[PDB]
Design a protein around this ligand. Sequence first.
Ligand code: CL
Ligand code: CL
Ligand code: MG
Ligand code: NA
Ligand code: NA
Lengths: 409, 1020, 204
Amino acid sequence: LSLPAGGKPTLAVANLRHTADASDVVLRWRVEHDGAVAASGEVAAEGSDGPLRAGESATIALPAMPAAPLGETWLTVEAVLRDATGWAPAGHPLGAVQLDLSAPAVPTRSPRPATPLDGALPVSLGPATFDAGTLVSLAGQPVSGPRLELWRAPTDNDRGAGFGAYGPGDPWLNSGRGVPAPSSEAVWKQAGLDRLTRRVEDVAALPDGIRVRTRYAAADSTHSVAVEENWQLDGGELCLRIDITPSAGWNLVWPRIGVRWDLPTDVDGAAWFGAGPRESYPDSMHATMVARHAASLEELNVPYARPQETGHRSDVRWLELDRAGAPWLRIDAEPDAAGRRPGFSLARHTAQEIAAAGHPHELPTPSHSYLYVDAAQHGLGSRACGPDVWPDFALRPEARTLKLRISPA
Amino acid sequence: ADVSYLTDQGPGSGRRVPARSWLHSDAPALSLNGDWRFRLLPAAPGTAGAGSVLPSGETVEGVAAESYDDAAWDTLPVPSHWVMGQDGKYGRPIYTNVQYPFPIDPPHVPDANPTGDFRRRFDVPAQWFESTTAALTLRFDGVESRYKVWVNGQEIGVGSGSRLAQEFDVSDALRAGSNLLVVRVHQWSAASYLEDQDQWWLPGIFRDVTLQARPAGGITDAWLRTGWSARSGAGTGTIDPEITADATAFPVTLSVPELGVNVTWKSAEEVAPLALENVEPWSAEVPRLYEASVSSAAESISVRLGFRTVRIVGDQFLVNGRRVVFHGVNRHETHPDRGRVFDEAGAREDLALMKRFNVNAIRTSHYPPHPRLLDLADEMGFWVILECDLETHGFEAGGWVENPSDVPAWRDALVDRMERTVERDKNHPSIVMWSLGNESGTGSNLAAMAAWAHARDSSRPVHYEGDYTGAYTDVYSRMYSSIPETDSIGRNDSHALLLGCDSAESARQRTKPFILCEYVHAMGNGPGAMDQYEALVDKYPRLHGGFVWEWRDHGIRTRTAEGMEFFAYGGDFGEVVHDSNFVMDGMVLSDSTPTPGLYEFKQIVSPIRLGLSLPAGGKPTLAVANLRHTADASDVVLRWRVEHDGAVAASGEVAAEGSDGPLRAGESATIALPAMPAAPLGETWLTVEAVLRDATGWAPAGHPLGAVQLDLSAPAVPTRSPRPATPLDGALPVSLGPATFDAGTLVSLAGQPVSGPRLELWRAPTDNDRGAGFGAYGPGDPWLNSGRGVPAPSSEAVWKQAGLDRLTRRVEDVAALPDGIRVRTRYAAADSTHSVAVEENWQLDGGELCLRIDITPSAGWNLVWPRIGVRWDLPTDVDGAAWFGAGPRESYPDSMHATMVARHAASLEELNVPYARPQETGHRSDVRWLELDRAGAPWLRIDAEPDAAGRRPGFSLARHTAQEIAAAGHPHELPTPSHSYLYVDAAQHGLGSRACGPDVWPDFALRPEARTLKLRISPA
Amino acid sequence: LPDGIRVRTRYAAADSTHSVAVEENWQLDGGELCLRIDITPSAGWNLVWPRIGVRWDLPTDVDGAAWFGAGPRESYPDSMHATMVARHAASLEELNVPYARPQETGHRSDVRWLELDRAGAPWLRIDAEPDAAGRRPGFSLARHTAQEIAAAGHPHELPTPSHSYLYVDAAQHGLGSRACGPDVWPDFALRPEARTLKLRISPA
Ligand SMILES: [Cl-]
Ligand SMILES: [Cl-]
Ligand SMILES: [Mg+2]
Ligand code: NA
Ligand code: NA
């Protein structure tokens, strides 16, 4: 899909089949405004002489689709089978593509950075309650956090060491076999990434807010990550900026950069606008659409035979957490200076507990639900048997900012 | 008395006022500039190693007291540096590049710590104490380094951040009538660790000291954040105002008369964004400003609005929706008499000179300039990278251990520096990037500066070249990356590792816009490669150009013990540690003379790119491309001329037009010029220049932007050389036309005593010839090892080891020819097994004196040669030359773009460039003929024939040998001339930039070869 | 201090991260002036050191010395065989060798005590106590500093003297023959170490 300067949305179609023409296929399109269908239709897959032949390409101009003045406008086109076969229903999708047609972004105006004040800390800020600067509840429910996390429950590929690692050299050298190296899990454990400790440097009032500065580091390590939270009320909304600024020494792939919130166990589902419906990671984004999505815990997370990282939803505009069936908390996320959006995961156990379990049935009975809001996740690759994560999708140490607005749903 | 303030790592102390803009306000104000009472102490009072620094009976901070008697004290101008303009009375400047001039022991500084006490009386109007005034503010725009302030004996506070503004609240200390201000300034402090810029160390109160009376219900700060997007017609402007003021200030009115805006806000809550139709955008090419004011009943602020929007989209740096290519320079305030003290008239002229050489951007290396400079950049049109005052480069050698950038004790200080940088200058449209500082490694504190800037100002990206892995910056910035590495950065099919990065970090840096924050190091004779870097920018959209290091030489005017004036550099002031002439690394000399390297820059970065060709049977065809960011080419005229052996035969003008009127930015066109038939004899050259039709604030009408030539000459007629002759027995000739010989030795030419020719391989080494940072390019494929070369000594080291500066001449034989003479000689250094054979065949051929010189090296020579040429020793009254060839300025194999083939003429002072350290200069290339003059009167002509390969020689004329020049550290150290020396060079080595940057690119490097000169010599 | 003074100083070159801490304890003990100097280098020093000592700046009329220790001529760790322990005396001219190129010369080793004279008249006496390892200091008396000497190509290029300089060295580097031959044999080469000087200073 493309939008030629001055034109209409233009659909390129290539029939990549070996023999069959595209007569069994119909192309269905929809335009959605913030996830809701505003217009839709369907076109036949035709070439220069009837149905698009095996090995033939064509282009089709679709109807004009003016951008909605506010919010986001997305075009999706899906190739589907017209008729049922012995193995699929009529309307079975073969594959899809999207085109962002959104009107120019209206950035939210963030609160000005504020000088800390002497004096008492606020007890409540909108839906948040604090005890001596420690978050204790959000929107009527007990909640702890945010807590920096770098650890993720290692994937099978994070545990692999057959192929070499791509980090240390040009990946095009050595026949693309990488540089002999320990597994990612081995280096992460050796760095103590699974056992970071939190130390409070200082807590201070802001005008209509609170600033908390913390420093995270593993026992027996010289490396650290400073974290600063600025909670501010801005026009009745609770704004939270979190700046994460690592020390200089860090020289390994990081599994993730995010913060964890500890929630009641009855927080059991989420809705979001962003990539979905399933989990996605930097080198695994093709089967995603930007739309409105919703899932319970069991739909969010894949029950892989060995418990590991699962369930990350990328490129999130907003999420809404459901509790005992009903909407409870809304988090809006603003893109950072580089236009990057965070992701989230919702889990019944911490990444440390998951990493410890050999099978799902070996996990303890849950005491919390955990929300991870991730600025970044490492790619997946296939190093259990095959190439490491391709360098473009590999996470190395970096400073990140999360810009959140938190409200009762 | 507590002197812990001297080593404190915090931002400063006392009655500090929150950082805000430098604003043009009508609030009552007065300047405290003038001649203050001053004394210099050798140490900081009250420190452990300063037990008896003060006069008997004076207490550590007694100087502050209103009762203190300073009647006998000298006075010192404020603003100034105490080490400048005083004949050394209070010490001298100290130059270091990277090394700190004190032990690396943070936060401690030496006991020998020049400390200046300043005392000033001044009057404050009684009116300033009326209820119409809410507060009284004392402002320091610049003090090096840390200082403590007392007013009427009360301690007010301590400042840090030498090039950053600091305001203090003196409301409670001042009185109506006469007041006292005392400032104690230390040269060294904990702040000096944060200020290791490559420049002179210059203590003192070097920017303005002022008082302002803050109006009750005034506006403390405003930020009129502007934006622009394209429409039909002019386009749409936006203002997103931020007003910092008390509730009593409202109503506040924003007025922009030209745009018809007059908006009154009745409370803080009404202050809101506005969109304005028919707004012309601001850019460096077209710096359109709109006058505006923001006022309450009590105070009016005048702003000039430039509407422009900066956006990064993937790897593109856009302003107003179009990619910006930076043709910039690194600049800081510099003056041989005044140091870093600002002078508006001088600054305007400086920026005008930049514009005349096609500079469109300035990086403020490596701290904010005087705030007034930014008004000039807004008005004259430069893209600006405004850089915070931070450089900890000296921590590198010890592996960055204790680097303030990653030490928590310094964090508050570093973030405060960024806050003061951003707040002062946030209103200026010329600023399109904030920079965190320079060469300070990496660390959590640098990332915290970036996080603060991002939180405060989303309108401008964050630049910092020490962020090699791209952990917290929005652009990828490098300094002196080679051509191979820069190519690797710009291209989309390379996963090669970049400096300091693993493969993932290298990939992420390639996702951002790229700039060279420093490149083509301009020190001495050079740089080469500017064309190679520009060709990468042409080729790869990710590459956005760069900033030359640097604009000006920083020479300090001083006198020898005998009273001879000169520009001093590092070490000339008796420094213990110093970095010599590395402070002399500008495109412009200390007296403001543009060097040949600046003319080369100008041509290469011309906004109107010209090409010439002659299609078979067609007419001369001119290709024209408008490479500008926004402006069409209506201001430009294309002037052509054809010259027959240098003399104009025909000329004309052509408009730069595209498909629809004037050639638009980004548009290309071709135009057939008139037919220009070749002269049947001699050479015919077409020159086309792009010139400004009309005058600007900074240039006259007809100011050239760039040029191109095309050779249209008739096929060459090769001259008939005398047949090689067999030598005869018997008497040598004495007289061969204009030459006279004594027993085969030349003694005169055309009535004047002359010696020669003498083979010469030595040249007086350029600063680049003396560099050894990057490796040399000879021993390997230059595209390997990221273009970093092979580690190796400097060219000068290998030349001296080989004895190239001390070749000896041995005559093998001398023989008569029929109407001539043959001389065979052999050249070699003492203790060397290598040699060069030289044969001279002088022959009269139809009454013309022909000289063929064949230079045939032995086999074992394995190093670069500086030159291959012959030297002639002439009378000192030989003092000018005319030639037909490349000119009018010196040129070298990797620096030929700003030359034209034509007839040129120059005296000795015009021929040779007075570089701060004497070195190779003055070579004129591609010479057809040269004529030497004796005080304007033509004396000797030499015609040169091209060799078998079509190569033409060049020449230089000098007052001293290459050997004497090489031995002199400054021009004034050269002896009184006893000869003029003509060097006729078959070859010269290229320039490169190895003093800091790549070696000479291999295509332009001189390696041992045999060469022939074919000359005809006649009286002129 | 009770009947004394303690001075703590730190020595380091510009642009260096290394340093040497020095503590002086001056204490009157039974009418005698005792001075203990403890020299304690930082960790990273990784090169041979020329000497470890202290310099005193004196009037130019201090122009001779008597001592009890090794003599009568200069001696260094790898050049001790022609010394005898005895009472010796020398003028400046007899103390220092005029080598064609001015360099280190004049070090007297294994000193129990030294007396400085002004025109033959004894002025100052310094007694040195052996350190914990039994090591004794040495001394040199010079008309110029080691820096000034290093800078001069010939004796006649030195400036008119403005002081006499006494160096009391805990250690000197050996001599070897590296201008053409083996380096100093390791047994005699000086590497960074902490040293103490224990002195008693009196009028002679
Ligand atoms: Cl913890
Ligand atoms: Cl000779
Ligand atoms: Mg130059
Ligand atoms: Na410096
Ligand atoms: Na420099």
